[PDB]
Every structure is written in C-alpha cells, then in structure tokens.
Write a protein that binds this DNA or RNA. Structure first.
Lengths: 75, 70, 145, 46, 191, 141, 59, 64, 68
RNA sequence: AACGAGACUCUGGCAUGCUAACUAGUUACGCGACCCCCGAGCGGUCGGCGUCCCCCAACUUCUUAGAGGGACAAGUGGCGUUCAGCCACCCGAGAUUGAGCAAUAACAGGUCUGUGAUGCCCUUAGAUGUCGGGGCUGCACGCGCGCUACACUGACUGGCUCAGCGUGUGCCUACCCUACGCCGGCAGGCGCGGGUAACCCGUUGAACCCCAUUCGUGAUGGGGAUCGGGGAUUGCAAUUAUUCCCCAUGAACGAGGAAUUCCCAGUAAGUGCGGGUCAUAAGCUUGCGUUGAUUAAGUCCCUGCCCUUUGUACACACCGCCCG
C-alpha cells in the first residue's frame, strides 16, 4: 500500500482550474480528475453532474459502473 | 437468460421460412435460405451439446479431487 | 466550498470530518453502522454529507438522541444490553464504559468460578471449539538424541 | 464427575446457572515434551 | 451496410491488414463482421477451426481470467464497448485500425525455447507461427489492463484503451511492447 | 396500453411517485429500524422504500394469478452471505408484506378473491394501464 | 428409484460406489361401459406378474 | 543483424522435433527466390502455405 | 477413429457373397435389405456393418479374382 | 479352437413419419366478462394484453412414452502392396457423447466391530451379557482433505428477470411436504385446507448474471475471526456454549518459499439446487441445472506401462546380491 492525498471538498485553485481544464481536455471521466488534481473521486462524480447542467461538458455514454463525458462535442 | 435468446432467434428464422415453404414457391425461400446459412450461428440448425453426467471422485465430470502421497 | 472545519473531538474518541456522517460515528465503540443509520434519522438530519459539515447545535442533539434511546422511541431489542444482569434495566453502553462493563462480567465469572472464568484465566476458547489444531503463537518441538 | 464428588457452597450470585459448571471433569492439561513420531523425523532403530 | 453488419456502430470497411504475413489469421470483414462478438459455442474441434472466428471476439474471450471473472462473458462485453468508445474520443480513428496495429506491433519475430544438454539449461532460438503471434499478442496486452486496475481508481476500460494506444504506436509504456522486446533480446544472445 | 409494452424500470419509478401524491398508503410506524430481509446486512438507503415496493407488488398481480403473503416474499428473497460458511438462498421479511397488501386493500386496488390469493380490483387494473401510457407520453416509446 | 451407495464394506482401498436403479411404469386405459362386463373380463387373461387396479369413477 | 526483415513462406512440413515435440522442422521457400530453400525450426503450430518473418537466413537447422 | 473390422464380419461377409452372389447390387441400402432376408443378423448396428463390407467386397469382385 | 478385446446393455444426439392422451398441451372459435384507446375508428367492431368461460370443437407441432426408421468408412478426391487401412471433402447427427459389464494368475492387501458366516483359544455370576454419570471435542507442537478471503472485473442498497435432477404424512412404533388467513423486526407462533402424488406443495416466480443509486485506493464501508448481552426452536435433558435469530465487539489476511495436484468441449472455472445422514443440524459426499473461456491436435525429456532383442554371481527376484 501507499499514501495518496485527496480532498473531499474544493478550495480556490482546484475549483478555478476545474472550469478551465474542460476545453483543454477531450476526455473527462471522474478517474482522470483523481490524478490531474488531488480530488477524492466521489467529489469528481457530482462535480461533473453540475457541469452538464451548464452544458460545459457533454454526455456521450453512461452506465452503472463507468461514465464518459466529453469537452463540448465540437470540432 | 442467455439460451432463450438463441432459441427465439432460431425459431423466428425458421418460422418465416415455413410460411414461404407452404404458401409461396421454392425460389422465394431458397434465396432466404442462402442468406441465413451464410452467417450460420445455429439459426437453421441446433447444437447437439448438452451436459455430461458426473461420476464419483470429482466435483466435475472430468476434474478430480487432489491426490496426496504424504 | 464549505471550508469551515474538519477533524474534531467528541466523547472518548476523535472523529474525523473527512468521512461521511454515519460511517464516521462508528469508530466510537458500542456503535456499529446499523446503530447509526437509525439514530441519524431519529435526529432528522442528512447522512448524505460529511461529518465536518455538522454544526455544534446539531451534534449536541446527536449524543442526547443516542444516550436516551428508549425515550426517543428506538426499540428495546435494538439495544446492546437488555437487563444487563443485576442492574435491572435495558441499557446502551458507549466507548469507555463498555470496557468497564466488560471487565466486570469476566471478574464475576471467576468470582463464582464457573467453567467460563477458568477458560478466560487460562487463555483458552470460551465457546465450543477445538483447540487441538487451533491456535499457535508456539510449534518449536524436537525429539532426538 | 466421573468418580469424584466435588463439593461446592451455593452462593446467591450463582442463581440461573447449572450445578455442573462449578465442577470440572478433566485435568486442565499440562505438557509435555513432544514424543517420538510427534513429527516427520521419528523412525529407525535397527 | 445493409448486407454486412457493422459492430452496432463501427465500420469494418476501411480496415486493412498491413502485413502480408499475418493476414489469413487476422480477418474481420470478409464476411466475418457481425453485430456482436458471440458464438453458439463452436470455436474448436479442429486445429484450423480456431483461426476463423473474429479478432474482436478472441479479445473478449482472453479478457476474462483469474478465477472470479470466469463465466461472465456478458460483463466482459461491457468493457469492450467502452474501449472502442474511449479510443475514438481520445485519438479519433476507425478504432479497429488501432487494435490491428496493437496486435501486429506486439507479436514477436523470434522466440527461444529449451533444449536438454548435459543436464544443464541451454536455450535455442527458433521462429514463430503467425497463429502464435496473434495468440501471444492478444494475451500480452490483456494482462496489462488486468494488472493496472488491480489497485488503481481507474477502471479496466480506461486502462485497456490506454494500452492499445501505446501498443499501436510503440512507446514502451505498455506491458506488451516491453515484454515483446525482452524475448527478442534473449533470442539474439542464444541463437 | 398494456403494461407489457413499456420498460419496467421506468414503470415503478413513476408509479411509486403517483401514490405518494394522492395521500394513498397508510404506512407502518416501523420503517426506519427495519432491515427488510433476513439476508441483508443493512437498512435501505431509501427513505421511501415502502412506496417503491407497493409499486412492484401491484405489478406482479397484473401478470400472475395472484398469491398471498408467502409468495410475495419468495419473489423478493435473495442470497444470504453466511460469512465463512457458503452462501445460500433464504426468504426475507413477512410482516412488511402483510402491511403492504392490507394497505393496498384499504384503497380497493386489491381484494381477497377466491382461489387462495388476493387479486387486483378492476379499479386497480384501470389505474395501471392509465399510467402505462403516461410512460410513453413522457419519454417517447 | 436411485440408490447410490458404497461398493466396499468396511471402507478401504480406492473409493468406489454403485448406481442401482429400478424403473416402474404406469399407464391407464379409460373405458365407459357397464361395470359388470368390465370386472368380469379384466381379472382373467393375464399371464405375467403385472398389477391391475379398477376404479369406480374418475370422470 | 543489419539485414532488413525478410519474409519466407512454407512449401512443405517435414516432421516434429525437440525433446517434447515442441519444435517443428519445416521447409520454406524464400519468397523472392523460387529455387532457394532453407530448412528451419519453427515453434508454433503451422499448416502449410503460411508466411513467416525471418530476421536472418544465415541461421539454418540441422537437428533438435 | 479406429473401427477396424473384426473377424466375425469378415467370416460371414465372404459366405453371404458366395451363396447369394446374384442378389447383390452395389448400393448400400439394397445390399442391407438382402442380408436381412437371406439371414438374420441379431443386432441392428451389426447389420449396418456387414452390408457395408459386402458392398466393399462386391466392388473388387467385378475386377480380378479375390483370393479369400 | 476357447477366454479377454470387440459384439452387448444403458444414456445422449436426428423425426411436423407412425401410435394416443380433461392426472399433458396447443390451436380454433363459441364466447360472454375485465382493461386501456393504446393503433384505423368513437368507446362498438377490427387489432393488441392475460384470466375466467370453455365444448357434445379441432388437432398432437410443443409435453409425455411406446413401436419403428437413420450412420455403414456410405459417396467423391488423395494415399497405401492398391491388400488391411489412413487423410481431406459433400450430404449431414461423421466413422471417439458419457457410463455399465470385463480374462489368466497373484497379494500372507482390507474386513472376526456387516453377517444367527466360521475354526481354535479366552471369559461366563465379584460376568467381556443392563440402568445412572463422565469420555471419544481434553493442547507448548507436526501433517493431510477442504471452506472463506485479501476488493473497484468490487462491496452495499433498491429494481428487473430465467431452470433442472428429485422428494413428500397414511412409513418404525409416532412421525411428512406445505399453500392460504391472522400476529411478530426476526427467529417464530397460531387458525384452516390439499397431497398415495404429470392430480397438492410447484406454470418449482433459485443464484451468478442484468439495470439504477452509494462508497473511493484508504487493513477502507475490503475481511468476519475472536467475544459480551438478549430473544426463539428441537428434546426426557442443550453446561465444555445442539441449532436459529437480534444488537455490540472488529483479528489474521494487501496474493503467498522449498515443493506439488487436476484438467482437452457444454470440458475447466464461476454459481445455485435436490438426495444421503437427520428428533434438532452440512464447510462432507452423491447427483442436477445455469453462465461458460485460454491452450493442444504433440512427444518419450521426466514419471510409468506394453512388445521384441541382449546381459546377469539376481529368484525372499536390485527395497537383490556381495568385499576388505
């Protein structure tokens, strides 16, 4: 085992980066938010649900055990 | 859940055929036969495979309990 | 958001604000996960957020709803103890009192000196179990010359 | 027990229990010194 | 399209085998394209019979291993539908051409074996069948995603699609293209 | 439409909500202390589980010939992890299902009919197929 | 009828068993006619050890 | 070595060798020269008419 | 595979061709039914074998002389 | 010429051919009843959904079990002495679906605790032949067969949806399987009814699987050992906890050395169920379904076995014999 740092709620830099990482990244899953930031992972699940209501991300597929989200579906 | 899916497919394939075999001519259904049997996947045929009967000295039909010499 | 507080101390055990409310509370002895999802609902609060997001007003109510469970209409069968024995009532025991209570019942069964206390004092299994192939701490045995 | 009548005084603190919990029926156990075949080494003599 | 199945959305046309060596044991589109990878359970009762069944199905078969996952072929197909999806968003290709490169780049060119002399280990270099290459390459990359997701927050779908990228474009960040080159490095030595 | 046509995951999630609006279902007091079956290790997350289960009760009666408190439990029962011992099947609670079916019968969406089992009232059968089309109206079947 | 039991008394040696089976057969012919001539003709003209059971009514 | 990747195809299978039958002798045609032929040892199951990927044709087989 | 014919087949096959040479065809099914009538073979599977060998012999007897 | 091999028996796989069925179904209406316009139309009708109604209806495809047929290396192409056979292919169920039965001769193999089978010896009233109690479960240790685990291909909580081999009171001496109604969180209690069983339980409304929430890489909510208190059931009796249930307690264990077992197609592995023992009780054994891979189409290297030739100081047979 190991020790990895995580945060269960946001602070400034995480939250502000969260809005601007979106157009920079084509793939968006909660797992990828775990590594690029230090985020719990369950935090990232609900964080993406918020963004989809704004239309800053787009759903592309959904399942019980895995969920995919994309940038804006533009090209 | 699984084997039912193959059963309903196998029946509807043959059902369609039989309707043409009885009320329409040969050359209608001969055509349809060539199409299905091309990607045959047990649509017009049936597996003969069913479970084999277990014999003693194993939990399965082939697999056996462990053997110790000491 | 919600940067207000994190790790805190409550009665007899330190409880983190890192974890969800119900599961956080379980660390305190005499409270399992099953016991906590009840007590939160009698308190009529969310269990869908962290323990660091509770206020002092709220957690003050929690311990009251916990330590008088019969008076907030949690059934008798759902308690740890029903008629302790020689105390005459239904009871619910929590962290540091649990150990004190436990050590009494050990002492009692060597006081009378039943089969129980002897097995306890010898360090052998209380319940019907074989000890022939069960245990080991020990195994270094030799016999040659 | 099996042969022996172990006498006991009855306390008011023993109520609810059975009689047979206060008299044992085996020697607690001691050991030992492992014996011969007590392992994968014991064997041979001639 | 109306006479040949896609994959449920993915064309099997505009898909090539870019070797002349490894085709006729890699095929996916001659008529062997189907909506799903599944069989009635005929796959082997002759040595040649193994070859015929699709590459995409073979991948699904070798994905379920190690005890708890055996006999759960439907759960396995969930991982494959996400894989192609992730591969297409992530790089943007016909996501089968990714897989075909990933298989061809992971198959060994020369291999070693054992030979008994003097009661001591000696090794001999030998060649390898095209059918061996395909079987090996399917084994190796599936071990990668299985290994990575054994304590990672990442799901096996994500891990597997990453593993096909680094195989399809060699970069030695995969479990496959590493282990390929290990064998060939041995085969040079004892030869 | 008949209830056969539609998805059933969707069916219950609109039927559960329907009942709770209309003041229907007089619920037992015990609903926040209830494991819900012998083979569970926890209470439900859901706080309106009673409403959800009454949906699934009335649906099965539409299909099959109707049966008592015993049979409902057998339909719901699942696997019991006995720890170190191997898992086995077992049946869940009874006294919950005995409150469910009597609560439905108070609304006269079911009734004790002949041949050893409650059966769903024509008023009940009307209300099922009424909201069955509401499902297709909603999304689009 | 299945009986699956040891082939070895006082178990020793390789563990073996033995499947025995008995197959019963039932079949019935329904007549509707006067009960006299039936009970007359039925009980006679039977060579083997085969059982017969007459019933008053069933339908 | 410094030879580029060669390709050569089976003409005939000869028989199996090795000390567990794990190696297979085979005759192969060079696929650029139709009168050239070398014998090889090949590990995997082969049929006939399939193509291999030789790293050299300096090597040649003679025994197990 | 396997399934090399036994001597019980080869003994009676020769006999049946010698004394009923005329009745034989060269079809499987016709040569079966003849063996069923000119003799009784007490099994069904055995009958299907003895016919097939009787057929296979009758092919060669229409060439040079057999030595059996 | 004979025994074994094979032949044989059982089982699986092929029948819209044959035989016949309210203790098995299907179809067809007759329908009348319920339901929603859900589609054309209006709600009727036509179509769709199941149930009651079903017959003096029609039929036997499905289910059931009987009589029969079918596969033979049969046909074709290679190969073989062109013999015996072998390889590929067509048709198609390919010449191997799995079991039962099994020779000569032998073993100082197991069983006097299956036997009112049995020799001889012993014991036989202070009995080795009956009631009460205790023990076969006692642990510093060594080994074998297994079960459950070490998580995210997961756990947890809801929702959906599929099966088969069987078995059951009227038996042993007191006992079965359970629907339905009522009461209880649960274990369970209580009131009624059916089943001699293709008739009642059971259209066996099972698990894995499937669909949607929650947890987040943390010895964590993974794991459930240890242990405290309380409630039920069986019995004449439950203490060294018979079994079952509720709350609490929360350990080792984070993929395993030297070694080693088993397996080739509905097979391995995962997963549940019935029977056996049973007053109460399977982590065992014996059968059955369900989901269902990877790898091989070989070889004598290891271990071992069959046949020939050869050598031998061996025959209690190399686990032999024999020297200072």
């Amino acid at each position: 085992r190991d020790k990895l740092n995580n945060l269960v709620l946001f602070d400034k830099a995480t939250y502000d980066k969260l809005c601007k990482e979106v157009p920079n990244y084509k793939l968006i899953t909660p797992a990828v938010v775990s590594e690029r930031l230090k985020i719990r992972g369950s935090l990232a699940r609900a964080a993406l649900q918020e963004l989809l209501s704004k239309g800053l991300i787009k759903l592309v597929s959904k399942h019980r055990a895995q969920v995919i989200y994309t940038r804006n579906t533009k090209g | 859940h699984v084997a039912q899916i193959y059963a309903i497919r196998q029946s509807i394939s043959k059902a369609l055929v039989a309707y043409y075999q009885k009320y329409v001519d040969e050359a209608s259904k001969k055509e349809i036969k060539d199409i299905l049997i091309q990607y045959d996947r047990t649509l017009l045929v049936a597996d003969p495979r069913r479970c084999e009967s277990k014999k003693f000295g194993g939990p399965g039909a082939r697999a056996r309990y462990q053997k110790s010499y000491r | 958001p919600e940067k207000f507080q994190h790790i805190l101390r409550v009665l007899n055990t330190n409880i983190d604000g890192r974890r969800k409310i119900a599961f956080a509370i379980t660390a305190i002895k005499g409270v399992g996960r099953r016991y906590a999802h009840v007590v939160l609902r009698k308190a009529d609060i969310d269990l869908t957020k962290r323990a660091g997001e509770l206020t002092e007003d709220e957690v003050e109510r929690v311990i009251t709803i916990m330590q008088n469970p019969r008076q907030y209409k949690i059934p008798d069968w759902f308690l740890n103890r029903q008629k302790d024995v020689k105390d005459g009532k239904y009871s619910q025991v929590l962290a540091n009192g649990l150990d004190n209570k436990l050590r009494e019942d050990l002492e009692r069964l060597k006081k009378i000196r039943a089969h129980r206390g002897l097995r306890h004092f010898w360090g052998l299994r209380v319940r019907g179990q074989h000890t022939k192939t069960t245990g080991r701490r020990g195994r270094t045995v030799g016999v040659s010359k | 027990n099996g042969k022996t009548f172990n006498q006991v005084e009855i306390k008011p603190e023993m109520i609810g229990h059975y009689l047979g919990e206060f008299s044992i029926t085996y020697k607690p156990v001691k050991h030992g010194r492992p014996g011969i075949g007590a392992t994968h080494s014991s064997r041979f003599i001639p | 399209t109306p006479d040949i199945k896609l994959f449920g959305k993915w064309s099997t046309d505009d898909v090539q085998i870019n070797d002349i060596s490894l085709q006729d044991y890699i095929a996916v589109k001659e008529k062997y394209a189907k909506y799903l990878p599944h069989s009635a359970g005929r796959y082997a009762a002759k040595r040649f019979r193994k070859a015929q069944c699709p590459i995409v199905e073979r991948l699904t078969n070798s994905m379920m291993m190690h005890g708890r996952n055996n006999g759960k072929k439907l759960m396995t197909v969930r991982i494959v539908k996400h894989a192609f999806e992730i591969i297409h968003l992530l790089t943007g290709e016909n996501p089968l051409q990714v897989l075909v490169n990933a298989i061809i780049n992971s198959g060994p060119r020369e291999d070693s074996t054992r030979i008994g002399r003097a009661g001591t280990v000696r090794r001999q270099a030998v060649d390898v069948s095209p059918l061996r290459r395909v079987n090996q390459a399917i084994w190796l990359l599936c071990t990668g995603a299985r290994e990575a997701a054994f304590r990672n927050i990442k799901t096996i779908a994500e891990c597997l699609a990453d593993e096909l990228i680094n195989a399809a474009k060699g970069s030695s960040n995969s479990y496959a293209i590493k282990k390929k080159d290990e064998l060939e490095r041995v085969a040079k030595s004892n030869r | 439409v008949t209830v056969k046509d539609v998805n059933q995951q969707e069916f219950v999630r609109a039927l559960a909500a329907f009942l709770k609006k209309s003041g229907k279902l007089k619920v037992p007091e015990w609903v926040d202390t209830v494991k819900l079956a012998k083979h569970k290790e926890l209470a439900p997350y859901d706080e309106n589980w009673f409403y959800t289960r009454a949906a699934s009760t009335a649906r099965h009666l539409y299909l099959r010939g109707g049966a008592g408190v015993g049979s409902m439990t057998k339909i719901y029962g699942g696997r019991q992890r006995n720890g170190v011992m191997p898992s086995h099947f077992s049946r869940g609670s009874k006294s919950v299902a005995r409150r469910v079916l009597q609560a439905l019968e108070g609304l006269k969406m079911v009734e004790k009919d002949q041949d050893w089992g409650r059966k769903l009232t024509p008023q009940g059968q009307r209300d099922l197929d009424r909201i069955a089309g509401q499902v297709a109206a909603a999304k689009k079947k | 009828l299945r009986i699956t039991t040891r082939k070895t008394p006082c178990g020793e040696g390789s563990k073996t068993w033995d499947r025995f089976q008995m197959r019963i057969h039932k079949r019935l012919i329904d007549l509707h006619s006067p009960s006299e001539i039936v009970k007359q003709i039925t009980s006679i003209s039977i060579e083997p050890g085969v059982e017969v059971e007459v019933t008053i009514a069933d339908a | 070595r410094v030879q580029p990747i060669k390709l050569a195809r089976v003409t005939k299978v000869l028989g199996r060798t090795g000390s567990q039958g794990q190696c297979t002798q085979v005759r192969v045609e060079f696929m650029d020269d139709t009168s050239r032929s070398i014998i090889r040892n090949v590990k995997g199951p082969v049929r006939e008419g399939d193509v291999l990927t030789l790293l050299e044709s300096e090597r040649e087989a003679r025994r197990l | 595979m396997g399934r090399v014919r036994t001597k019980t087949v080869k003994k009676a096959a020769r006999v049946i061709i010698e004394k009923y040479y005329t009745r034989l065809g060269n079809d499987f099914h016709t040569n079966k039914r003849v063996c069923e009538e000119i003799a009784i073979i007490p099994s069904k599977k055995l009958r299907n074998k003895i016919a097939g060998y009787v057929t296979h012999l009758m092919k060669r007897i229409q060439r040079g002389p057999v030595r059996g």
